[PDB]
């Protein structure tokens, strides 16, 4: 019945917050100013569980070890091993003196799967280990009022229905129902996604508990002020608790790379069973009984299984993952590194992921001119002109009249990431003055504050009077700040380049239009003014006791406006542009206000400059929005209030007809709905988030991208990729590597798939022509698991033949990893030439030793026999058993060498899919060593003292090393001219049939 549980969790949350104080206290049975008695608290403590989310489901290490021994590729090698032991049992019990080939091969295949499992498991475990070193869970205590007394206890020791007080800086313990607040502003950024610090009022405001102000939430931190509240939800029942539990209980899906592996195996086994079955029937038609035919069937089918391709593909993915870890782009999954390259739609989170999630001074209005300060996360943008007296006055008003200061350890920290105490706005102002105005320490103590006036609840304004230490005027300096609509009512003078002017409407109206520019831009504006008090009417000894009119509220001198907003990260704009260049649909998904989300989207690249929304067209035409046609607007903003009242078809239409979509005010569950809707299109979706709301979206997506520091722990665990550096450009690096390794994998696969033809064809003609075995099993193992390992791995180091960040995302149903073109090239043409070269070397060796190639027909009947020591060759000679068998093994060895020789040119041609060998060039040093090591290793396997005794690999006469050279040259020439025609004729014959 877990289906019903997950379904009841996918629904949006509900509440009873909208209740009178008497009704809430009667429902919960709790005093309003004293809470409850401690015995009652302990009774609820041992009633439902401590206030802490139940730990995640522990994953034992033996479970995931066995997991890495299975899947799809490893499963194929497993059935191969099982078939080896099956054929071995049939050969053991049925015939005299059976051979131990199938048994050697069975144990070897089993070992391959086990070793690959150990390697892959060690990699995934390494990533999980460095991830465990990131849990910096600091036990935080809550301030609870019980029995009429305040006490700080463990957050787990908190229960339902009791008074809880929170101070500005304290994290909200559990979900509270605000009962009495005083200037309280909480941060709901990690949960609902609201950027600016949302205030919390005890009075019920919105039907939606997320938008209301009388509710404190789990994992939300009180920015400023103090507040009181009764605990309504506790533990997992909390909002973020149900969110985390939902994220853990969601499906992960099938990665595109794994699906491609499945398709590859389908074709491999398809042709394997076709050849095995048709040859089984052929063998029974010839003369072989059911026994021998079954053995041949298993041999042919298992031979068509790339034994070494598992490890090579795994190591390829591991190498790319290594590069991901070097750039602090960790992947918890070994194959999630590829998912970026297959992505075609990125559902990004705004606050925290796209933006820096921090209020920062954006623009200023000085001398009737707008000045854009540097808003990057590391200070690398343009700086304004800081040389005018207007800027000095404005910066002094900001640095002096503000309730923001640094702390004790804020020394060796940058001006941005350092900690500030007080309001978020005041923190932004303090950082801007500490950055573009020198420092604020000596700047604030130089003007000793006499009397201050903090911000008022109504008719907002913040002012203060300071002493002026200038060596020209001893008059007092009065400063004030506030909302522009509040400062325009308390001003008459205007500052311009140093001198004052009246409040002339010719420039005052310009001030209003500039205010509308900054406000309509999704920013919060604040006006700053100051005035010199007449020292003749207020001497240097008079104290301006704050009770009556001692400061001229009007006739002040306004200097300029100072706006602020959460800016996007540094490489975020460029990165977004890159993703749109690669052909990826960037969709913003957030629960923030639309007025800010639209501006941020225009600022990052999700909304192009020129495109208009469905509302923008009507606004431009001064007509109702119901008149315009949605097809005329390429972009659209979707409000969460309207998203709840939607069907699947409507969302499908929204996505299909609108290229730039901005989902705003979306609940966490609705974020999951957005991701599922994008997945219904059949495309690959990637979700980049940070808050707890992005946990289900990152879990259900094909790949979740979380921030290493600015992201909540829940969404960081439910994601598949972590950015320890929080650099969004890593997404771009990701989509580059995914496609890169994908294409390289194609190459690396084709290579190993090419050697299968010369590995099986000797046995096939051994069955047809009844000639001695041209290629033994041990030599085949020396090829698949010996020499070709380094060339196949070096093929993963291949670079981009063209700009991959220019092409569109691969289509899932069209661009498959392994298609008929790849098989037509490897199994059809190249592997064929390699097989012919092997047979050439075979016939050459046998004919030169006295067995003419024509004389070998039907000779296996007397060859495989161990007692016929007088087999007549072509020159009338009588060959004993071990003599001709020595020739057969000294024929298997150069056959293997021949395979290496053709693999030289095969590696070179597979290195370049479309470009030429001369275009790409042998710059891949790892590949060069692949050829050198492969060649030297083959030579060692043939000439080491005792190879013919241990591996039955007898030494070779030097002429055999040249028996395959023309075949390799021909392979290289044919594939080179093929690529040449692919270049000159990018039409269809040489491109749609061979280019794989």
């Amino acid at each position: 019945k877990e289906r019903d549980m997950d379904e009841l969790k996918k629904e949006v949350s509900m509440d009873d917050h909208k209740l009178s104080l008497d009704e809430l206290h009667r429902k919960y049975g709790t005093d309003l100013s004293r809470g409850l008695t401690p015995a009652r608290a302990a009774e609820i403590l041992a009633r439902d569980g401590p206030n802490a989310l139940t730990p995640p489901p522990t994953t034992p290490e033996w479970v995931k070890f066995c997991r890495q021994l299975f899947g799809g590729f490893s499963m194929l090698l497993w059935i191969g091993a099982i078939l080896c032991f099956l054929a071995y049992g049939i050969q053991a019990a049925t015939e005299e003196e059976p051979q131990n080939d199938n048994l050697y091969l069975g144990v070897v295949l089993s070992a391959v799967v086990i070793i690959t499992g150990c390697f892959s498991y060690y990699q995934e475990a390494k990533s999980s280990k460095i991830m465990e070193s990131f849990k910096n869970m600091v036990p935080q205590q809550a301030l609870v009022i019980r029995n009429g007394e305040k006490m700080s206890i463990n957050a787990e020791e908190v229960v339902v229905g009791d008074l809880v007080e929170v101070k500005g800086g304290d994290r909200i313990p559990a979900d509270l129902r605000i009962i009495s607040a005083n200037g309280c502003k909480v941060d709901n950024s990690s949960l609902t996604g609201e950027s600016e610090p949302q205030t919390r009022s005890p009075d019920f405001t919105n039907e939606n508990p997320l938008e209301t102000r009388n509710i404190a939430f789990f994992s939300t931190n009180c920015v400023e002020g103090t507040a009181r509240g009764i605990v309504v939800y506790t533990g997992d029942r909390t909002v973020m608790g149900r969110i985390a539990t939902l994220a853990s209980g969601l499906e992960g899906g099938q990665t595109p790379i794994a699906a491609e592996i499945e398709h590859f195996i389908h074709i491999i086994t398809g042709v394997a069973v076709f050849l095995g079955v048709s040859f089984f029937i052929l063998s029974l038609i010839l003369e072989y009984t059911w026994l021998e035919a079954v053995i041949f069937l298993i041999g042919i089918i298992v031979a068509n299984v790339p034994e070494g391709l598992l490890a090579t593909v795994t190591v390829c993915l591991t190498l790319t993952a290594k590069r991901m870890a070097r750039k602090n782009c960790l992947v918890k999954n070994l194959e999630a590194v590829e998912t970026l390259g297959s992505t075609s739609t990125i559902c990004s989170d705004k606050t925290g992921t796209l933006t820096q999630n921090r209020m920062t001074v954006a623009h200023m209005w000085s001398d009737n001119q707008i000045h854009e300060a540097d808003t990057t996360e590391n200070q690398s943008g343009v700086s304004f002109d800081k040389t005018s007296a207007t800027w000095l006055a404005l910066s002094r008003i900001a640095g002096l009249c503000n309730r923001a200061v640094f702390q004790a350890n804020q020394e060796n920290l940058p001006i941005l990431k350092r900690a500030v105490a007080g309001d978020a706005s005041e923190s932004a102002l303090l950082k801007c003055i500490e950055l573009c105005c020198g420092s604020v320490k000596e700047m604030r103590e130089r003007y000793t504050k006499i009397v201050e006036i903090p911000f008022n609840s109504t008719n907002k304004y913040q002012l203060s009077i300071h002493k002026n230490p200038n060596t020209a005027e001893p008059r007092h300096l009065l400063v004030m700040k506030g909302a522009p609509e509040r400062i325009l009512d308390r001003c008459s003078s205007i500052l311009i380049h140093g001198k004052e002017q009246p409040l002339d409407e010719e420039l005052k109206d310009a001030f209003q239009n500039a205010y509308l520019e900054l406000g309509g831009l999704g920013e919060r504006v604040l006006g700053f003014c100051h005035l010199f008090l007449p020292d003749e009417q207020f001497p240097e000894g008079f104290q301006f006791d704050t009770d009556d009119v001692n400061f001229p509220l009007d006739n002040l001198c306004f200097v300029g406006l100072i706006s602020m907003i959460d800016p996007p990260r540094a490489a975020v704009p460029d990165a977004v542009g890159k993703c749109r260049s690669a052909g990826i649909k960037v969709i913003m998904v957030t629960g923030d206000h639309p007025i800010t989300a639209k501006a941020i989207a225009k600022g990052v690249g999700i909304i192009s400059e020129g495109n208009e929304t469905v509302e923008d067209i009507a606004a431009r035409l001064n007509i109702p929005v119901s008149q315009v046609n949605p097809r005329d607007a390429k972009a659209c903003v979707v409000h969460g209030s309207d998203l709840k009242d939607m069907t699947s078809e409507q969302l499908d239409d929204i996505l299909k007809y609108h290229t730039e979509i901005v989902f705003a005010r979306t609940s966490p569950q609705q974020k999951l709905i957005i991701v599922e809707g994008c997945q219904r299109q059949g495309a690959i979706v990637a979700v980049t988030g940070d808050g707890v709301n992005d946990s289900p979206a990152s879990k259900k997506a094909d790949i979740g991208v979380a921030m290493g520091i600015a992201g909540s722990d829940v969404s960081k665990q439910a994601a598949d990729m972590i950015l320890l550096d929080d650099n969004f450009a890593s997404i771009v690096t990701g989509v580059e590597e995914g496609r890169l390794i994908f294409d390289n994998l194609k190459k690396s696969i084709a290579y190993t798939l090419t050697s299968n033809i010369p590995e099986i064809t000797p046995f096939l003609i051994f069955i047809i022509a009844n000639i001695p075995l041209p290629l033994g099993t041990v030599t085949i193992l020396c090829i698949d698991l010996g020499t070709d390992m380094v060339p196949a791995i070096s093929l993963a180091y291949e670079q981009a033949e063209s700009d991959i960040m220019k092409r569109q995302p691969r289509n899932p149903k069209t661009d498959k990893l392994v298609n008929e073109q790849l098989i037509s090239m490897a199994y059809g043409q190249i592997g064929m030439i390699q097989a012919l070269g092997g047979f050439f070397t075979y016939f050459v060796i046998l004919a030169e030793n006295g067995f003419l190639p024509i004389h070998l027909l039907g000779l296996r009947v007397n060859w495989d026999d161990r007692w016929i020591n007088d087999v007549e060759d072509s020159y009338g000679q009588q060959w004993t058993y071990e003599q001709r068998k020595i020739v057969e093994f000294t024929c298997h060895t150069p056959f293997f060498v021949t395979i290496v020789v053709v693999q030289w040119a095969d590696l070179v041609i597979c290195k370049t899919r479309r470009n030429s060998v001369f275009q790409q060039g042998m710059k891949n040093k790892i590949l060069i060593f692949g050829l050198f090591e492969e060649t030297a290793l083959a030579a060692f396997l043939s000439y080491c003292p005792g190879m013919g005794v241990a591996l039955r690999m007898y030494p070779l006469k030097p002429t055999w090393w040249f028996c395959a050279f023309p075949y390799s040259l021909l392979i290289f020439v044919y594939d080179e001219v093929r690529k040449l025609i692919i270049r000159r004729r990018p039409g269809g014959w040489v491109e749609k049939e061979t280019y794989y």
Partner: protein, 32 residues
């Protein structure tokens, strides 16, 4: 006799070549 092949010299040369090409490849991946 023409029925005797100096397999020892060929094997020796094969081993020398197998060592030279391998160490040269090691120098290849080490561009310094």
């Amino acid at each position: 006799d023409p029925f005797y092949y100096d397999y020892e010299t060929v094997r020796n040369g094969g081993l020398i070549f197998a060592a030279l090409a391998f160490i040269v490849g090691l120098i290849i991946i080490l561009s310094k």
